[PDB]
Amino acid sequence: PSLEDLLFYTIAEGQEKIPVHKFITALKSTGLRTSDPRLKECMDMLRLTLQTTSDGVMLDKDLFKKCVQSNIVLLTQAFRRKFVIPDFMSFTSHIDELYESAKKQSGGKVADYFSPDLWGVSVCTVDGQRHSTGDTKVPFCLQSCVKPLKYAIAVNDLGTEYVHRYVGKEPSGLRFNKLFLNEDDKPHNPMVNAGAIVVTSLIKQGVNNAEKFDYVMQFLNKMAGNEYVGFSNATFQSERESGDRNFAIGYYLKEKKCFPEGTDMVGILDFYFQLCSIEVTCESASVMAATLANGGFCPITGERVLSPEAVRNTLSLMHSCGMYDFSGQFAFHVGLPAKSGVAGGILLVVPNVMGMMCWSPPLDKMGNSVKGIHFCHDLVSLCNFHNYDNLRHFAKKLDPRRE
Amino acid sequence: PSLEDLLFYTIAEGQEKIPVHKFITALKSTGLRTSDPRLKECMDMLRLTLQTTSDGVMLDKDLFKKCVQSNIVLLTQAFRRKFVIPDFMSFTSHIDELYESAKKQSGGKVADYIPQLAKFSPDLWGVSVCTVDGQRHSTGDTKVPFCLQSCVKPLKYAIAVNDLGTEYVHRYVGKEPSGLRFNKLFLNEDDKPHNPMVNAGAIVVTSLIKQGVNNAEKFDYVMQFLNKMAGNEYVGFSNATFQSERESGDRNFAIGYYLKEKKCFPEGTDMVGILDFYFQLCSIEVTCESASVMAATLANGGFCPITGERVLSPEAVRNTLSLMHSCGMYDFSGQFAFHVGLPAKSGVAGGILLVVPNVMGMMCWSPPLDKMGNSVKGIHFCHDLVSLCNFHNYDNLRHFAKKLDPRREG
Amino acid sequence: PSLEDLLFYTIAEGQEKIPVHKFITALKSTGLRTSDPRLKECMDMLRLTLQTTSDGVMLDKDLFKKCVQSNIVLLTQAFRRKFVIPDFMSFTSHIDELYESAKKQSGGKVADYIPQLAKFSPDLWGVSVCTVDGQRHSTGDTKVPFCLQSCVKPLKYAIAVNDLGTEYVHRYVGKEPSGLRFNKLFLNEDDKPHNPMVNAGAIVVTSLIKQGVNNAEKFDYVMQFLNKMAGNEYVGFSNATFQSERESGDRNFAIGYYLKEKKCFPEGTDMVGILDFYFQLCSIEVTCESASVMAATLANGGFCPITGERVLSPEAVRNTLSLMHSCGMYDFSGQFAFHVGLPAKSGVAGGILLVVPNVMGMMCWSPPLDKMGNSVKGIHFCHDLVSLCNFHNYDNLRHFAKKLDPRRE
Amino acid sequence: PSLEDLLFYTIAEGQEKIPVHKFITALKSTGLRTSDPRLKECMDMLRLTLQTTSDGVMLDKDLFKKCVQSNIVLLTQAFRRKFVIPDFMSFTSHIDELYESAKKQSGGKVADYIPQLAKFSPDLWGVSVCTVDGQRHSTGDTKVPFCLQSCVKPLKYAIAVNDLGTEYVHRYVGKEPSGLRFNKLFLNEDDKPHNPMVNAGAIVVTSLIKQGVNNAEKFDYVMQFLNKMAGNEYVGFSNATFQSERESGDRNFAIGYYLKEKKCFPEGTDMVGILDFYFQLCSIEVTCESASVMAATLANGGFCPITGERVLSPEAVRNTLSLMHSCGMYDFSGQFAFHVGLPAKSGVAGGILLVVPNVMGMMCWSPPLDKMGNSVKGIHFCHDLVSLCNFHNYDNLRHFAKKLDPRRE
Numbered sequence A: 001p002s003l004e005d006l007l008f009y010t011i012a013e014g015q016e017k018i019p020v021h022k023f024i025t026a027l028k029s030t031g032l033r034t035s036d037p038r039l040k041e042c043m044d045m046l047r048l049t050l051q052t053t054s055d056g057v058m059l060d061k062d063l064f065k066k067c068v069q070s071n072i073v074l075l076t077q078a079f080r081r082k083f084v085i086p087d088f089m090s091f092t093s094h095i096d097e098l099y100e101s102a103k104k105q106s107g108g109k110v111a112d113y114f115s116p117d118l119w120g121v122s123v124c125t126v127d128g129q130r131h132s133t134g135d136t137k138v139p140f141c142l143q144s145c146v147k148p149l150k151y152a153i154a155v156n157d158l159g160t161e162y163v164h165r166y167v168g169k170e171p172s173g174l175r176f177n178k179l180f181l182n183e184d185d186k187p188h189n190p191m192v193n194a195g196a197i198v199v200t201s202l203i204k205q206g207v208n209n210a211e212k213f214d215y216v217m218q219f220l221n222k223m224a225g226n227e228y229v230g231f232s233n234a235t236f237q238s239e240r241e242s243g244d245r246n247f248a249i250g251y252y253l254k255e256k257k258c259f260p261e262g263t264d265m266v267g268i269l270d271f272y273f274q275l276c277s278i279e280v281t282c283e284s285a286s287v288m289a290a291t292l293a294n295g296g297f298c299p300i301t302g303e304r305v306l307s308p309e310a311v312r313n314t315l316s317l318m319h320s321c322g323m324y325d326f327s328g329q330f331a332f333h334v335g336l337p338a339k340s341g342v343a344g345g346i347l348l349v350v351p352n353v354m355g356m357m358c359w360s361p362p363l364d365k366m367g368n369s370v371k372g373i374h375f376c377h378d379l380v381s382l383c384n385f386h387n388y389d390n391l392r393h394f395a396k397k398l399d400p401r402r403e
Numbered sequence B: 001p002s003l004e005d006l007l008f009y010t011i012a013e014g015q016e017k018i019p020v021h022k023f024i025t026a027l028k029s030t031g032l033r034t035s036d037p038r039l040k041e042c043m044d045m046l047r048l049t050l051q052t053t054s055d056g057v058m059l060d061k062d063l064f065k066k067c068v069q070s071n072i073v074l075l076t077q078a079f080r081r082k083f084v085i086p087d088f089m090s091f092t093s094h095i096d097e098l099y100e101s102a103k104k105q106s107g108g109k110v111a112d113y114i115p116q117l118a119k120f121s122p123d124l125w126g127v128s129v130c131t132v133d134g135q136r137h138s139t140g141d142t143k144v145p146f147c148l149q150s151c152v153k154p155l156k157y158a159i160a161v162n163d164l165g166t167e168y169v170h171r172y173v174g175k176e177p178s179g180l181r182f183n184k185l186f187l188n189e190d191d192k193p194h195n196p197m198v199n200a201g202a203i204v205v206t207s208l209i210k211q212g213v214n215n216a217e218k219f220d221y222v223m224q225f226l227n228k229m230a231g232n233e234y235v236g237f238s239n240a241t242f243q244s245e246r247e248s249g250d251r252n253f254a255i256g257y258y259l260k261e262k263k264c265f266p267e268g269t270d271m272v273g274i275l276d277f278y279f280q281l282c283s284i285e286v287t288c289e290s291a292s293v294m295a296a297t298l299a300n301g302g303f304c305p306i307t308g309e310r311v312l313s314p315e316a317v318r319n320t321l322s323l324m325h326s327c328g329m330y331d332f333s334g335q336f337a338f339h340v341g342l343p344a345k346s347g348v349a350g351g352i353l354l355v356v357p358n359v360m361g362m363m364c365w366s367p368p369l370d371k372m373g374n375s376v377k378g379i380h381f382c383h384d385l386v387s388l389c390n391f392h393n394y395d396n397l398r399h400f401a402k403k404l405d406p407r408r409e410g
Numbered sequence C, D: 001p002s003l004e005d006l007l008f009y010t011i012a013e014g015q016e017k018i019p020v021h022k023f024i025t026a027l028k029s030t031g032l033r034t035s036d037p038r039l040k041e042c043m044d045m046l047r048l049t050l051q052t053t054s055d056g057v058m059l060d061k062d063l064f065k066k067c068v069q070s071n072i073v074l075l076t077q078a079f080r081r082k083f084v085i086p087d088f089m090s091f092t093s094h095i096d097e098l099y100e101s102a103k104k105q106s107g108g109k110v111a112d113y114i115p116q117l118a119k120f121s122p123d124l125w126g127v128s129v130c131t132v133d134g135q136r137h138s139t140g141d142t143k144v145p146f147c148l149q150s151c152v153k154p155l156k157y158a159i160a161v162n163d164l165g166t167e168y169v170h171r172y173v174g175k176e177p178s179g180l181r182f183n184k185l186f187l188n189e190d191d192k193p194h195n196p197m198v199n200a201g202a203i204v205v206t207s208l209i210k211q212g213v214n215n216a217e218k219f220d221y222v223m224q225f226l227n228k229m230a231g232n233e234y235v236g237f238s239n240a241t242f243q244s245e246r247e248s249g250d251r252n253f254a255i256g257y258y259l260k261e262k263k264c265f266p267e268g269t270d271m272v273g274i275l276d277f278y279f280q281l282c283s284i285e286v287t288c289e290s291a292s293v294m295a296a297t298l299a300n301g302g303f304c305p306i307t308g309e310r311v312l313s314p315e316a317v318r319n320t321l322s323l324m325h326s327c328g329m330y331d332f333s334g335q336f337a338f339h340v341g342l343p344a345k346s347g348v349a350g351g352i353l354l355v356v357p358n359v360m361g362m363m364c365w366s367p368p369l370d371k372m373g374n375s376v377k378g379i380h381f382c383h384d385l386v387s388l389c390n391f392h393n394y395d396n397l398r399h400f401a402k403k404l405d406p407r408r409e
């Protein structure tokens, strides 16, 4: 036997040669993208062999074999339907319905401190299967969607028990919404501004703020498989002009000796405003999400980006603390680690399956995207993705993991 | 072909006979117990044909075919290692090390506020495992009865959601943890108790089961309900604890009257009776083994693993596991949800009902409590368990560093 | 000279005899009432001498002299305009305007939660004054009995401190206002109720009076105590209010059970009994006149102004006036202390027991409550009173702008 | 007759002439000081005619007459024992033992969080009295300058209310104590600070004084005001403390930013500048003698007792006394209001601005603080003071048990 050859006969049909368009539509139908970085060597060798001629072009058994031999292990598993969602092409048609029925919820206010009709969802599974619907490629800032990401970096570089010398691990209480510190004089959790600010003070001490920002950008690039990550100076300067609450928080933390020694608080706050003005798209962000869904390995490159300890802690606190005052209601009904931001984003993680990012700017009165919240409810109302759904007895729900 | 076609010829060895002890030690090493109710028909025909014929006593394939034919589906996936934990004999050897490593934790105080919990020796300590396929294991003081106390709150919440639905129940009780000092308030800001796992919410949930009927039938209804969760293993009642809970309970009488004034019960409720039904549900008796099957029922989407019976709706089980995650270990719940990530529920007798979804249910029991109300040995065992297996709610099933995955063997 | 004789010459005009009607209207304009108890030796001797003959009936200087001689000390100060309010008849006419300007305040709802407080007309309204010298005045429905309800908490707290002292009593109850919503917590952080003016603290204070003795004698002792505080004017009891309060009081039962687990009572307490005693104490009946004398007793350092009897220790009167200042009007207590500055205590029947220390006691009553539980017309009257006289606790007695000062001439 | 002979009566003793020391010792024994500003015309003419005449030197009846003629009203009231405390020499001797008995109280920590406060020996301790008539007395370290710190909060609140009225000021600041674990919240539920005596509320009051003007005139305007409140005795400024407060004040910067975010200031407020104006007002310096005259102005309905000038409106003085009563001693306010019953305000330098309305103002000072921030010797002196005289806000002015009443003999 030869595993490059018998994949050739899976796609060949019995016909003696394989056209290359038939290979790319068979591939794009697994849900992989032909621009997948784990597919570079194979797609290099196929642009190479269509300069060779231009009369077709079908591939022999040795030509297909020498196009795919260095990527066949990932390609067989794709074609023997061994990915986390085997029937990926049906699943996106459900994503499309969930997207389109959430598209009809017009209500909400867009943050004013900017079209209210943008709405996009993007999926990245832990195997790299991708799909998008709507305005999936318009940049927007993470705002508070960065709080799990910089927390993950902090825990990765420093460990849990150092990070949680400075910030708690529990939800406030649905009217300790207003206190900055718990009773041990630590912020409640990394997902509120006070805790996020302290987490930002922990990343890359000893070096100046420009290199700190670069290190987080490098880190976010690995999480997104080197897809789109940018920076909006406009939101930066407007958050730097409007942040009297974050300035109040910084002065309270300084006096209560809540930062690591040698901290410049007023600078840390400017670093904090930079990190909330970082730009993503729904597609780039969904890869970040899928990195957390995949135990710390980026799904479209295979690179270990975050330690399992960071990814677990981050998923744990997005569960309890991730959707502002709606976190309890959200944890009960949806049961997924999620994190919302005031541009309208919701970074969503279905552990061991997929990462998601949906984005629509109109917010509900608790600060969460209306359409995003609607989509998340519908998704778990249709598939056994809820954290405490049973994988064997699940009533009317769908399990996209099965055939 | 068929399937006995090859289950017998699987372990037969090639030899045309299986001695019956070699079949039962092969069975008991899967971790099933020969008294498993789904093995009733098969074990009867082996007791019988060890009377029909007693000179062997080996089994032909045509004799083995009539012992296992009505239990064959469970016996092949039992023997083709398709149970959730395939190498069960290694797993229990880990359970044993974690049991013996928590056994050295001296600390804690036994609950004394009633004389009937101060009679349980502080040196008792038992853990029991019931996986979702019926595999069992026990170590320590595992057949000793003790009262559920607040381990019963998730069980009765699940009963209420099953019979009444999520939206009726939660007109009367919330779905979030207090806040680590709204732990003292009886009501959240919508004038509902915070969640079913605290005393005020448990009392209100008790108010919802089996309305219109008197307390004797209400209790019977919950007891048949708990009997099915436990696969008809031991469920009892300690009248000694009930009478002593009934007059040391001024806290719950304070709660009951506040809830009446704030009109938190359903119409037509006799609150002082509800308080007596509530004191009874907290005196229900289990052992670690019985309770571990109850837990495994929540681990199995609502089906009891040792009978195959549907006991709770998936919506009830999911709601109950959701609220045990956030609110199940008193003030320690946030830390527990972070570090352990398993749905668990603590009681003042020393129990910790533990559920690892899709894998197993557990009950650990040691009476000494830490200052927050949780069994010290349980808390340590739970911490040690998750530090050794990728059972945490947000461990990854593919990349888990040095941890073990007993759902795998390679 | 002589003290009975010069006064005859103050009242005589120069005339050789005094008609006895001219003497009693001269006396009633002092503001004293002819039924004043410190005045009965004198009013006995005038009923005696209008049997003599009924053909006159004027008094010589020796006939007037031994009618008034055993009450002469009180009548000279009365007629030498030495009472705390010398021009009492202008003051009542000001009190009359305050009564009539509050009569136009319609709002409020009458309590329903007992069919005994919802039977009361929404238009009854009375104010009564008893000064620390005994001068009396009333306007409106001042002789209609109604229940003290929570106006009794300062009274029983005073009894408690009188019998046991401040340091014993405040082992069980605090001395401060909670905070404008720690109003919903039962206990402060030392596991004592916040202060005797909230139900939790009132319940605990009820547990301190007359321990060891059964509830029937405990109730008798408090009634004797209230009898002295009111100069033996009207004190009654509504069993209708009692039984309806005792079947509707689920919050008060919640409170007692909570205080019991938290070991808040003195040892040997039967908690469920104490709640029944607490419900009895809130069904005690007064009128605006009877209650105003109780108030005037607190205004007068513990002496009842119409009998001269020491009723409460000065230590009890100060503590009770302090906590009525801080804690006496439910959620309005801060606003009330700021604007009115008078120790007051409101109850759900519509009463406001009000004290102007060193001057007068008052009780006003109108059943409609505002959204915080206080009588609308009572609250309005109290505001106007201090907006017109320098009675506010931190008004200056020398520089007070346009306010009136009824203690001066 | 007229007042100058009848003064010449009493002072003569029978002699036909008065030695001038004998008049001055009789004058100093009323407790007036010969430097009292209302007495300067009399004292100039006595210094003058002790140049004119070196002949004795006693004063004839016309020599006494034209020295006291322009101050004769204040000297007869002084010499007819008509001042609020007539036996001033017995009273100060009581003040002396109260001071000496608090001198034995070892405890407390000197505020050290700024080096300008560690430099104050923990053994300085002074109390000063200014009665509402100008009578003065001091014991201990009463001429040592120290900063008002938070004793300035009632003073600037009084300035704001005098210029702006109660209803404008309290659009931005409440009227109640927080609650004794709302020690940490900045705003009550209407998004106003709880009251002017906490840091957030004081900061907001600083927003209201002299808006539209820059900080230099704003400060000058407040300094005029304090000068007149102290009858032009010592009011200074510690620039050393100001720089250390603007350097350590992240909690006030935390507070300023929170108040900015919730629009608690008036439109057009520069908040970080208001924080600098607030740090200046806390470094204003007094001594115990200077400050005690400030206190007496609040004791006197807005008139400074040693100059006769109207400085604050009666409404300002009442509001400020009300809130010092409830909120002026940090977390100890409820205990203090209960046990002491006097308007007081403490500061972290160790001062306690104290007011006994209608009688006297005081400032006590010893730098060691107890764990709640109040001067240990001050709190003790206050307890002893009210445990000795019927000055408590709700003591009775007629029935006060064994306590002393310095307004009587």
Ligand SMILES: O=C(Cc1cccnc1)Nc1nnc(NC2CCN(c3nnc(NC(=O)Cc4cccnc4)s3)CC2)s1
Pocket (backbone or CB within 6 Å): A175, B184, B185, B186, B187, B188, B189, B191, B258, C184, C185, C186, C187, C188, C189, C190, D181
């Ligand atoms: O603990 C201590 C001492 C302390 C003090 C300070 C800090 N630490 C400790 N004080 C206590 N006194 N009483 C207690 N038990 C009471 C049960 C009866 N009450 C309620 N229970 N639940 C209630 N719900 C609501 O208020 C609803 C609501 C409405 C609006 C907003 N939020 C919530 S009111 C009061 C609590 S605790």
Ligand SMILES: O=C(Cc1cccnc1)Nc1nnc(NC2CCN(c3nnc(NC(=O)Cc4cccnc4)s3)CC2)s1
Pocket (backbone or CB within 6 Å): A178, A179, A180, A181, A182, A183, A184, A185, A252, B181, D184, D185, D186, D187, D188, D189
């Ligand atoms: O909300 C409003 C208005 C309101 C009032 C009432 C009801 N609803 C709304 N008031 C507010 N005032 N200030 C606010 N902002 C922060 C809270 C005060 N500070 C703190 N931050 N964290 C803190 N915690 C600790 O004390 C730790 C601790 C110790 C003990 C117990 N528990 C906790 S204190 C900084 C400013 S909000």
